[PDB]
Every structure is written in C-alpha cells, then in structure tokens.
Design a protein around this motif. Structure first.
Motif, PDB file in Angstrom:
ATOM      1  N   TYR A   1     -10.226  19.870  -4.467  1.00  0.00           N
ATOM      2  CA  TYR A   1      -9.045  19.618  -5.284  1.00  0.00           C
ATOM      3  C   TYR A   1      -9.402  19.426  -6.748  1.00  0.00           C
ATOM      4  CZ  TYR A   1     -10.227  14.631  -5.475  1.00  0.00           C
ATOM      5  OH  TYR A   1     -10.850  13.430  -5.698  1.00  0.00           O
ATOM      6  N   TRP A   2     -10.638  19.019  -7.056  1.00  0.00           N
ATOM      7  CA  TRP A   2     -11.037  18.728  -8.460  1.00  0.00           C
ATOM      8  C   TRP A   2     -11.335  20.028  -9.213  1.00  0.00           C
ATOM      9  CZ3 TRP A   2     -15.757  20.907  -8.847  1.00  0.00           C
ATOM     10  CH2 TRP A   2     -16.496  21.042  -7.673  1.00  0.00           C
TER      11      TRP A   2
ATOM     12  N   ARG B   1       0.822  -1.200   0.000  1.00  0.00           N
ATOM     13  CA  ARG B   1       0.000   0.000   0.000  1.00  0.00           C
ATOM     14  C   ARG B   1       0.860   1.256   0.000  1.00  0.00           C
ATOM     15  NH1 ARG B   1      -2.604   3.251   3.725  1.00  0.00           N
ATOM     16  NH2 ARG B   1      -4.628   4.027   2.985  1.00  0.00           N
TER      17      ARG B   1
ATOM     18  N   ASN C   1      -7.641  13.012 -17.227  1.00  0.00           N
ATOM     19  CA  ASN C   1      -8.328  12.042 -16.387  1.00  0.00           C
ATOM     20  C   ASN C   1      -7.400  10.957 -15.868  1.00  0.00           C
ATOM     21  OD1 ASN C   1     -10.802  13.356 -16.787  1.00  0.00           O
ATOM     22  ND2 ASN C   1     -11.118  12.253 -18.706  1.00  0.00           N
TER      23      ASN C   1
ATOM     24  N   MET D   1      -6.702   9.012  -6.285  1.00  0.00           N
ATOM     25  CA  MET D   1      -6.247   7.870  -5.500  1.00  0.00           C
ATOM     26  C   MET D   1      -5.635   8.317  -4.185  1.00  0.00           C
ATOM     27  SD  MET D   1      -7.331   5.424  -6.984  1.00  0.00           S
ATOM     28  CE  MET D   1      -6.599   4.072  -6.085  1.00  0.00           C
TER      29      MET D   1
ATOM     30  N   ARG E   1      -5.991  13.260 -13.154  1.00  0.00           N
ATOM     31  CA  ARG E   1      -7.005  13.550 -12.147  1.00  0.00           C
ATOM     32  C   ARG E   1      -7.363  12.314 -11.335  1.00  0.00           C
ATOM     33  NH1 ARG E   1     -10.796  12.260 -10.303  1.00  0.00           N
ATOM     34  NH2 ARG E   1     -10.849  10.726 -12.008  1.00  0.00           N
TER      35      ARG E   1
ATOM     36  N   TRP F   1      -8.311   8.643   2.736  1.00  0.00           N
ATOM     37  CA  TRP F   1      -9.639   8.476   3.314  1.00  0.00           C
ATOM     38  C   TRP F   1      -9.822   7.077   3.888  1.00  0.00           C
ATOM     39  CZ3 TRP F   1     -14.791   6.665   1.634  1.00  0.00           C
ATOM     40  CH2 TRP F   1     -15.821   7.258   2.368  1.00  0.00           C
ATOM     41  N   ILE F   2      -9.399   6.056   3.155  1.00  0.00           N
ATOM     42  CA  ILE F   2      -9.497   4.672   3.607  1.00  0.00           C
ATOM     43  C   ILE F   2      -8.096   4.178   3.921  1.00  0.00           C
ATOM     44  CG2 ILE F   2     -10.119   2.341   3.009  1.00  0.00           C
ATOM     45  CD1 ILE F   2     -12.446   4.149   3.634  1.00  0.00           C
ATOM     46  N   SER F   3      -7.863   3.847   5.183  1.00  0.00           N
ATOM     47  CA  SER F   3      -6.558   3.417   5.648  1.00  0.00           C
ATOM     48  C   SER F   3      -6.530   1.905   5.814  1.00  0.00           C
ATOM     49  CB  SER F   3      -6.210   4.114   6.963  1.00  0.00           C
ATOM     50  OG  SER F   3      -7.233   3.915   7.921  1.00  0.00           O
TER      51      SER F   3
ATOM     52  N   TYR G   1       2.811   5.752  -3.648  1.00  0.00           N
ATOM     53  CA  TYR G   1       3.833   6.506  -4.354  1.00  0.00           C
ATOM     54  C   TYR G   1       3.574   6.544  -5.852  1.00  0.00           C
ATOM     55  CZ  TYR G   1       8.240   7.902  -6.336  1.00  0.00           C
ATOM     56  OH  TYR G   1       9.213   8.552  -7.053  1.00  0.00           O
ATOM     57  N   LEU G   2       3.034   5.459  -6.415  1.00  0.00           N
ATOM     58  CA  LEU G   2       2.820   5.408  -7.856  1.00  0.00           C
ATOM     59  C   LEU G   2       1.702   6.338  -8.292  1.00  0.00           C
ATOM     60  CD1 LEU G   2       3.264   1.654  -8.751  1.00  0.00           C
ATOM     61  CD2 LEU G   2       4.958   3.420  -8.301  1.00  0.00           C
TER      62      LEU G   2
ATOM     63  N   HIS H   1      -8.014   8.842  -1.695  1.00  0.00           N
ATOM     64  CA  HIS H   1      -8.675   7.619  -1.263  1.00  0.00           C
ATOM     65  C   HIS H   1      -7.782   6.725  -0.426  1.00  0.00           C
ATOM     66  CE1 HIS H   1     -12.067   8.877  -3.315  1.00  0.00           C
ATOM     67  NE2 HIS H   1     -11.945   8.227  -4.459  1.00  0.00           N
ATOM     68  N   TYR H   2      -6.469   6.769  -0.640  1.00  0.00           N
ATOM     69  CA  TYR H   2      -5.565   6.126   0.304  1.00  0.00           C
ATOM     70  C   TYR H   2      -5.540   6.873   1.626  1.00  0.00           C
ATOM     71  CZ  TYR H   2      -3.643   2.843  -3.055  1.00  0.00           C
ATOM     72  OH  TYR H   2      -3.483   1.819  -3.957  1.00  0.00           O
TER      73      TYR H   2
END
Ligand SMILES: [Cl-]
Lengths: 315, 315, 315, 315, 315
Positions: free
Chosen positions: D156-157, D67, D190, D198, D193, D204-206, D72-73, D201-202
C-alpha cells in the motif's frame, strides 16, 4: 517497592486495635456492657457498604495514575535537542564546539533548575545554586547574571532565554548556515521548555485536597464499621449467622490488605518525585542527559565512518 | 481548602433535620401517629439504594476534573512567546527594545482581557478598561482604538491582531532579519491565541445543566431516604434488626461526609476561576507573566556571559 | 434547559400509568384476580436489578458527552485564520483589502455550507443557496461557479479550494511578500478545513443505533418492573415487608426523575446542533465570526497606535 | 441496523431452550427427578451475580467503541491533500494538469490498496489488481512497476513513494515554484500516509482474543444460571418466593435483550469495515474522494470569479 | 492465544485443591471436626464479596490495555522516513544511492538497538552486537565507533546522531538541494527518535508493582473464600440453602474461568514484547522495515512510469 513495606505501619496498628477490643471483650467487657456490645455487631455491619467505598477509590486512583503517567511524559529530556545542535550548529574549531557544549548545557541547566524545585531527591543533591555551580551545570559568571535578575518567581526559564540569545548569536556568525535550521532549534527548544513548564504546573496544581479527603474518609469510615461490625462475639448466645469463634479475624485483614493497599497506590503516586522506591530516578536522568549530550554534540560531531556498502547492496 | 469549610453549612443543617425528627419522635409523635411512623423506617430504608447514587457521582465528577484540568492547561502563558521575541525581534536601540516590550505587552494584554471575562478574581481587579489602562497593560491611545471598534462581542482577540500588525511591521523594517523567524512568531501566537480561545469556550459551554441536576437529585433523594429510613425508633417494640437506641446517628453522618463531600468536589470545580481556595491563582499568574516577559525580552536581550569552558571540557 | 421541561411529558405519563393500575386495583381488580395480582408484586420486584441498568447508562452517557464535547471543539472558527490574513496578505489599496475580505469570506462561507448541513438551527436560517447569497456570504457570480460543479456530494470544501486559488494568486502578485507567509496561510487553512471535515464526520457517523437501543431497553425494562413490583397492595393481607399503603408512590417517582433524567442527558446531546436550549448557538457563532473577521482584516489592517513607552519602562 | 436483526437468531434459540425445559418439566420430568430439579432453582439463582457480568461488559465495550471511533478518524481522506496540490503544483497546460491529476490519483490509489486489505466491502469490489486497473486508479503501465517489486508484504505504501518521486520532479521543473510549497506537499503526504498506516495497524493488532473470550464466557455463564435458576416451578409445593406460574418468562427475556444486546454492540464494532449496516461506507468514500479530488485539482485550478465587493463593504 | 493455554496450569490446580477438601470432607474429616467445618461454609461465603474484586480488576486492566496499545503506537517504523529520504536526498550515482541506503540503515539500526533491549524475542535473535553486524544493520567499522563511546547507558540514540551528521553532510554537498528539505529530514527523525524514546520509557517505567500486587491479592483472596465458602457439605444435616450435593462444583469453575481469566489478560499485556502468541511480531517488523526501506529509497528512487492520461480525463 512492594505492599509489605508501606502497609506494615498500618497492619500492626490494625491488629493492635482489633484484638484489643476482642480479647478484652471476653473478660473486661462485663455482662452489663457485653449486652450493650452485642447491639453494635449487627448495627455496624448493617451500614458497612463496601461497594461505594470501592467505587470512590476506583475513579480517584485512575485519576492519579493518569496524572502520574503524564508527569513522567513531561520529563525534561534533551535527547530531541541534541540531534538538532549536532546537525545545525557547525564548526570543528574551538569556538564551534564551545557553542554546541554550551547550548546543551543551558538545556541541561534548565532541567536541573526545575527538577530541584519539584523533586526532593534532586533538592537533596543541589540544595543551593552553589551546588549547581560546583556540579558543572552553571559557570561562575553565569551565576552572577542569574542572581542579579529582579524576579521573585521561579527562574527555571532563564537558561531557555540564554539558549535563544546564543542560538541567535550563532546564526549571526554563520555557524548556523541555513535559516530553517535556526527555526528548527527554537522550535525544539519550546517543546523542551514546555516540558519544563508542565512539571512546574503539575507541581503547582495538584489533585484537589477535598477529593483526596473524600476517599480518605470513606476508607477510614469503612475500617470503623469493619472494626466493630465484624467482631467475633460469643458463640453460645445464639445470634443470626454467629455461632463460631475463630479467635483470629483472618479474612478481614485481607480486606485491609486490599482497601488500604488500593489507597496506598494513590498515596505514593500523588507526588512521585520524592525519595520512594517507585519514584522516577531523576538523579539518574540528570546525570544521563548531561553525559550523553556532551558526548553527542562534542565528540560525535561530524565523526562518521566511511560510506561503505551494505551487505544487501545487490542481494 | 479542606472539606470542613464547605460542608459545615450542610452539616449543621443535617443535624438540625435529623435529631429534630428523632427527639420529637419520642414525645411529640404521639402513639396514634408513632404507629404511622414505624411503617416508614422499613420503607424508606428499602428503596435506599446507595450503589446507583454512588455510580452517577463517579462518572460525573471525573467528567468535571478532566474538564477542570483541561481548563488549567489552556491558561494563557506568554512563556513560549517570550523566547521567540527575544530570539527573533532584534535591535539594541530605543526602537528595537520598544518592539519587544510592546509585542509581549499585547500578549499580556490579551490574556488579561479574556481572564477578566472568565475569572471573578480578575474582574474584581480590573472592573473596567480604565483599570487595565492604569495597571499598564493598555496605553492611553490604544484605549481609543480599542473602544472605537464596532463589535458587540468579546474583544479579547484585538491585541492578537495588533501583534500581527506589529510583527509584520518589524519584518518590513528588518528587525526580524530572517523569514522563518517571522513565521515562527505568528506560529507561536496562534498557539497562544488558541489558549485564550479555549478559556472563552470552556466558559461559554459548560457541563450541561441537566446532568448537573441529575446528580443533585440523586444525592438529595438519598438524604431523604437516609433521613427517615435510618431513624432510631424505640427498642422495646421488637422490630427486625432494631432493638437499639444510640440516640446519636454516628455512622449516617459519615455517609453525609462522603456523599455530599463527593458532590462538593464537583461544585467548586465546575467554575474554578472564582474566589475559592483551590482556584487557579490567576492574579498571581497575570503579575508573573507580565513581569518575567518584560524581564526576558528587555533586560535579557543579548546579555550573555563570556563563552567560557565547562568543568568537563576534557574529563 | 432544565430537567422539568424534558421529563414532564414522561412524568404525567408515569403517574397516568402507575395510579391507574393502583386505584383500579382496589375496586376494579376483583378478589379472584386480586389474588392473581399479589403474585406479581413480589415477582417483578425480584428481578428488578437497578445496578446493571445504572451501569449501562454510566458508560453510554460518558461516551456521548465526550463525543458532544469533541463536536464543540471542531466548530469552524475563523479566528486562527484572521490573524494570518491580516499579517501576511498586504496592501492598503483597493485590491489589497479586497483580497483580505474575500479570503475571510471564503472561510466564513465554508463554515456556513457545513453548518447548514449539520445544524437544523442554521438550515432554518439558510434553507437554500439563494439565502446564502442574500445574506452576503456568497456573491451572485460565485453562485454560478458553485452550482456548475458536477458533484453529487456535499460541496462544503469548494470555498476552501477557492481560498487556495486566491492565496496562490496573491502570492504571484507579491501581496504575500514572503514564502513562509504563504505556507502559513495554507497550513492554517487545512487546520480550519479539517475542523469543517470533523463536523461532517460526527454527523455522518453517529453513536451506534444498537447501543442507543440497548440503554433504551434497560431503562424501559426497569420501569415495567418498577410499575408492578413497587405497587401499593392491601396492608391487611399480611405480606412480607408490606403492611403500609401510602396511596402516593412518592419515592419511586424519584427513581423516575433520576433514571429517565440520566437518559434524557444522552437524548439531547446525541445531536446537539438542533433547536434545543443547551445547543451550540451556531447562528450566534456564524454572525460573530463573519463580523469580527471583516473587522480584523479590513478595518484593523496596519492601524496601530504610536509605539509609546510602558508605565514600567524603567521601574 | 437495529437490535432486532442481530438478536433474533439468539432470541428464538433462547425460547427454544427455556420453555423446552419448562414445559417438559411438568410432564416429562417425573416426580423422582422433579425433586432433583427443585434443588437447582434455588442453587443456580444463588450464584447468578449480575453485577460483575454487567461490570466486565462495561469496560470492554468502551474499549471497543473508543477503538471503533479511532478506526474511523484514521480513514484515508485526500481532502487535506487536494488543497495543497491545487495551491502549489501549478501550470494551466497539458503537463501541468497531468501532474495534479496523477498526484491525487496516487493518493487515491494508496487509499484503495489499504482499504481493499482491511474492508471486505472493498475487497468484493476490487478482488484483484486487474479490478483496480479497470476502475481507473492504476494505469496499465503502473501495474507493471507495481508487480515487479520484490516484496512479500503489503504494498500500500508504493503510491506514496510514487507521490514523492513525482512531487520532487515537479519541483525540479519549476511547477512547484516555491520551496516551502514543496515541503508542505511532503508534510501533508506523511499525515495522509500515516492515516493509511493506522488502518493497517488497527487491522493487524486487534482487541485481544482472551479479553474477547472473557466477556463471552461471563454472558454465556449468566445465561446458564438464568436458564435454570429462573425456571417456573410448581406453585403448590410451597417454596420460598415461588408460589406463581406465569407460564411465560416475560421479564427474563428483557435481561436477554439487554445483556446479549450489550455484547452484540461489541460484536459488530470489533471489525467495522465489513458488510454490516452500521459499517463505514467505504465504497461511498472511495468514489467520493476520487471524484472530488479530480474536480478540485483539475477543473477548479485557478478558476475564480472576479474579485467583486462584498455586501458589507462599507456598512 | 486463547484462554485455554494460559488457565490450565491454574485450572488443574483449582480442581486439585477443591475436590481434595471435598472428597476428604466426607471421610477423612471426622464428625468431631466435620462440625468444625460446617461453621466455615456460612462464614467464608459471608465475606465473599464479588463486586469490589470485580471492581479493582476493571480499572486495572483498562490501565494496562491503554498502556499496551500506547506501547504499540510508539513502535519504531521507518515508513514515515523513507518517503522523505527518497524525496529529498538526491543523486542517481554511486554516492547518491549510498546516502539513501545508509540513512535508512541508521534508522533501521536504531530501531534494532532499542527493540533488542525491550523485546526478549529480538534479544534472542540479536544477543550481541556481533549479531547486529552479521545481520547487516551495522557495518564492521561502525562497530568500532559504537563500542569506543564512553557511555554506561543505552546507546540506541547513537545511529540517530549518525543520521544527523550524515544528513548535514548531504546538505553541504548539495544532494539535499533545498533548505526546507533538510529541515524536513531532521523533523521526521525526531518523530522517529521519540518513538524509540517512548519504548525505552514504557520499559523503564512500568505499571506500579503495588497496584499489580493489590489486584493479585483481591483475586487470590476471593479464591480462598470461594474454596471454602462454596463447598458442598452434607445435605441431610438441614442447613440454610444447603440440601443438595452435586459432587462436582460446576458453576464455581465458571467464576474461576472469568475472574482469573480477567487477570490473565493483564498478565500477558504487562510486557507484550515477549515470546507470547498475542505479542507484537517485532522480528516480523524488523525484517519488514529493513526490506521495504532499501526497496523504496534505492530501487524506487526516480523510477516512475510515463505521465499518461487517466481513464476519467474528460468523462
Ligand atoms: Cl516550516
């Protein structure tokens, strides 16, 4: 789909082999060979190493359930194709809706021709091509062009070629008005056609038979050490850690529940397209994707509500 | 393809080394050196740790079978390309079907030129380029342009360049009528050409030789501790957990079946393109993809049935 | 590339530390401190737990070899780009073939500028930009525009911008006749340019230093317990499981072969671009992709054989 | 970034708890309760099982470092977008280079607005939107349109929508001359974006808090068994495997180095965007991608050398 | 979301079963059956093997948390679609902004129709289609066309077909001016529509019930051996490693904290869309993606600041 319907054929077999050599140990095993039997209960328990047999099951089953999950993701679904055929292939007339229904039939036909060669639950529904004609996926005259192809391989790719000869004929007549629209159709066919190609390849190349045989040796080498090295011998003879006689090997069955049940996970997932309970419901999916495609590209083409305002249009 | 055809060369070797040092232990090993031998049966069994040798096999084999599976997915199949050439490259005439057969020959040729450099089963079928000419994949005059290229590397990419010079010539003549159609051809070549490029790279870069050597040490360091530390010594000498003499080491062979059989999984999957039994049938796949491509782009181009109604047209 | 060339620097060191404390144990370790030494041979062997040290190596090395394999897949190869430049960028004239050779030089230049910053085997070949000029990848006047850029970062992306300014100039002159052809060029650059971007990021972000230090502690904490807890003490003193004196610790070296050899797999794969034996032959790949690109886009542009019939044209 | 700067807060704590209960064991622990203490040194060492605690760390840390690598990617890099804006968005004039600098500013702005909400090292650099205005990423009047949006979520969007309203305005004015060129811009937005999506979301969800708590129990349940079950008791009392008194628990610290150091790998990688030493240098990456984008699309637009011949033009 | 709110229902149960058979062991278990009970405390502890039960949990939970993470990545987010609809679907007028709001409503509607069939937290918010009408996602007359579809399957794909019939109507009226712009819309729908298709498939095909049952056997077979084999018997009877009576089994609860807590990780992640604490906040995500889409395509369409210079325009 639980563990009690798969293991009971081996569970009554394990009681039939354990207590037969335990009850006859007291009476039929005479004292000249009871002494020969006490030399094995500390021998078979010595080499009974339960960490490497639990090791080899761990890396083998997670190879299977990753392959079983990847078999499911490559299921041929026409849902990504029915949004392009209703979008691009136009025409309200008789010929225009005959293009959209035929183009989604060829995608529905070429998902049947591969699933009847990888699933036993589909092959029992379509045993011959006459049963694919009578179901409605192949017409009477497309069965003449199908069977007059000089090919000794699987002919699941044939409707995906009929898709391209039809989508290029719709483009030449102007029923695909654009040019990126025609490219989008053949792009979303090759995604679908590769999904049929993967299911042919998970069926052609399996988990290797020697690696299936190594784990089957290790579990069934454990249950020969467990069958003898965990026998209930006489309490009054004064052995090391043996002065009890439960007369019912209650815990060792819980290591048959768990070791053989771990292997039975890999047994019914090595070919998940069969007639099991946790199989992929392929006959449900064939009737689903054929129904909702002919609903989406025929009875839902350019059938929209009025463009009416939202509830939040100025709130 | 089972375990009995790979392990029997090591199975008769293991009986030939075990019982030779067990039968001669009773007679040839005299009492002045039988006492020297009893000091090792509790020594080699002490350091015989069977959890880390089962550990290092687990992470090594799942590296191999993930690499063996990824070698299979990058097999050069022209099936995703034969749907584009029959769709885009048009013409019923002599020149038009000569484009479609040549374009799929170049894809079929450039799958042979790489598989004859990675598979021994294909190189025994095409030992020289004269055998690729006589099979029909390369013509007589394309062998002059092939061999007059100043390149000391593998020339598998040469037909994928002839594909682009031909697909750009078909576009200039109007046999590829559209412009996204021409982009779709070169898009689906580079997916195919990368599939030939991966097989060159799984062959060029292997599983590292030291990591192949570490697991081969650990298994063959275990079977020296198992060869001595699990010997059947005399029962009447009164040792710890040793008062039996089976005279046949029945269980320790079941740890040779399973440890060396686990390694033999990784032996025949380290280069799966050879002449094994669970190899990829590459000579089957070369004859398949060359036959069904010249069927699909030549005898199935714009050969459709009549657009006739479905069975479910109003039901 | 085997294990004997990496481990012998630590193998002579391990014999030099083991038998020095074993031979001097008999004579230099006097009886007042020989009794102090017998308290440690059952102590260091007690906490010598070889399952978790074999555990932490297993999950660390498979992180490395997955990262080592992903470093190889992101190698900058111009092979997917040379099929587009020969297909789209047209012209038989002097200017037309000067576009195709320059466009593939910029891709070949921008694979050198990143590989000379991540590989020591390439940086010893191109120590300065003057050595990239004299090799032929950068011209004399492109070195003026390269070095007059106010940027303190790595400038590997500069030829990928010169690619876009050249491919947009070829489009404005009509040497890229189509419009999806021009989009296909910039699509296959950003796949190539991301491949150069990954190699900069595997070099910038490594396997974390603390996780490299944890496994290096555990192996070198094991070989201090193994160095003392597996010493050959006197046989005549009557200890538990110690009445032998091999005078050569033959098996414990086989646990130095395997534990330190497992770590040495992760040592030479933590930076596989160096001057090792199992390194990626990057200087082979730079000379390969520069030669076969200038062969494919210059001497193979629109140089085809006659469209002649197949051997299987009517068979 | 090594292990000595993270573990020393727990290393002085472990010596402060071990030898405090060892030195006071000799004197403060009186003989009526020294006998009570000898019943625990063979009890806490009995249940001290170090294989499952080494097991649960192995599968938890490799979830984290997979994770951590995937975080990083998905770093927002504008490098794949600066090659499209210099290729497609044309114009040498004042307005033409004002499009290219603004379009790459919006990509650079929308990488700041997400990294200041996931990195503490960036939020200490841009605490408010006034610090994003004064840095130069957002102009004075784009801060009025930013803060007058009725949205209670992360914004951010917003620059990725300003990108699309600007790239569609450049297309309407003819500064994006083609039509696949305009599609290529919104395709590569996109991808960018989603890279910002991501990282939201990394964050927000750990990794789940209970699975972080299970491994923290097991390590700190081991170091209570290790704290008591590996105590140095009196040698003269004649216990099993206890007749020594090192007076310094030298090896058990090497199991605190390795078990707690393994967990400390997962501690500093559970949120790698902080102010650690092995963090991603995000403030380096924000200044890098903002500098090299305004170099590539402004000072390198259509600034090429002369098309001059190669060194290998006829060799 | 911690471990104390999930385990306390089993923690008070484990104290209620342990000390009930420990306190009544001293008094209610009489001496004729206390002797029968001492034969089990060295028997159930003998087969209590805690390495394979820790093994089977390790490979099962990492299957779940990889599946739990892949369920999250396929969450239907309209953020990649709102950048295309504001870019391509044009018009400042009443009809033009009615296209953009409706097109993003259909994407927002078809994320509700699938999340109300996989999440219990959404189904308690939208129990019927009347609650999807009154929320604002479906209009009053789109509910007539929804419920008059002869389909017995899930109808989540219906708004994704209304998207294609609307986006093809906007193309025919010239509100999608280009042709790659129209292809980009249907490309980014099928990415979104496959994200809704994955959530239907992770819900339809679960982790297999037998593999959920095998790990549940092994943990609850361990806690029957732990319940009896780790009982505190009388100290004065003189057993092996048993001469203490803590009268509180303090360490064995720490193996219930960790083994059952490891399984409780897999319990609440086997269906993460429920009403748990570490669930995906789906009702937060439905209100988010519906608000920020109608902000982005309606109130942010072609609403840009003046193209004004940067701070770094010549610095
Ligand atoms: Cl396109």
């Amino acid at each position: 789909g639980s563990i009690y319907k798969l293991l009971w054929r081996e569970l009554l077999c394990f009681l039939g082999l354990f207590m037969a050599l335990s009850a006859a140990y007291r009476f039929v095993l005479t004292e000249e060979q009871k002494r020969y039997f006490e030399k094995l209960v500390l021998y078979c328990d010595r080499y009974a190493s339960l960490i490497p047999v639990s090791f080899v099951l761990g890396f083998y089953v997670t190879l299977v359930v990753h392959r079983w999950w990847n078999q499911y993701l490559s299921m041929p679904l026409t849902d990504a194709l029915m949004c392009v055929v209703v979008g691009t292939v136009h025409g309200h007339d008789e010929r225009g809706r005959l293009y959209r229904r035929t183009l989604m039939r060829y995608a529905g036909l070429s998902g049947v021709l591969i699933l009847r060669s990888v699933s036993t639950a589909v092959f029992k529904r379509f045993p011959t091509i006459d049963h694919v004609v009578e179901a409605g996926f192949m017409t009477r005259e497309e069965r003449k062009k199908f069977e007059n192809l000089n090919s000794s391989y699987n002919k699941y790719w044939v409707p995906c070629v009929w898709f391209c000869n039809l989508a290029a004929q719709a483009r030449r007549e102007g029923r695909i008005r654009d040019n990126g629209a025609f490219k989008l159709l053949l792009e979303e066919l090759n995604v679908f056609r590769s999904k049929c190609g993967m299911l042919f390849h998970y069926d052609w190349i399996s988990v290797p038979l020697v690696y299936t045989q190594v784990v089957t040796i290790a579990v069934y080498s454990y249950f020969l050490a467990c069958l003898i090295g965990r026998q209930f011998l006489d309490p009054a003879q004064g052995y090391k850690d043996h002065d009890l006689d439960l007369c019912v090997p209650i815990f060792t069955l819980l290591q048959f529940f768990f070791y053989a049940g771990w292997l039975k996970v890999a047994e019914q997932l090595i070919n998940p397209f069969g007639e099991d309970d946790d199989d992929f419901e392929t006959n449900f999916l064939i009737d689903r994707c054929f129904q909702v495609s002919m609903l989406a590209v025929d009875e839902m083409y350019d059938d929209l509500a009025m463009l009416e305002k939202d509830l939040y249009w100025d709130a």
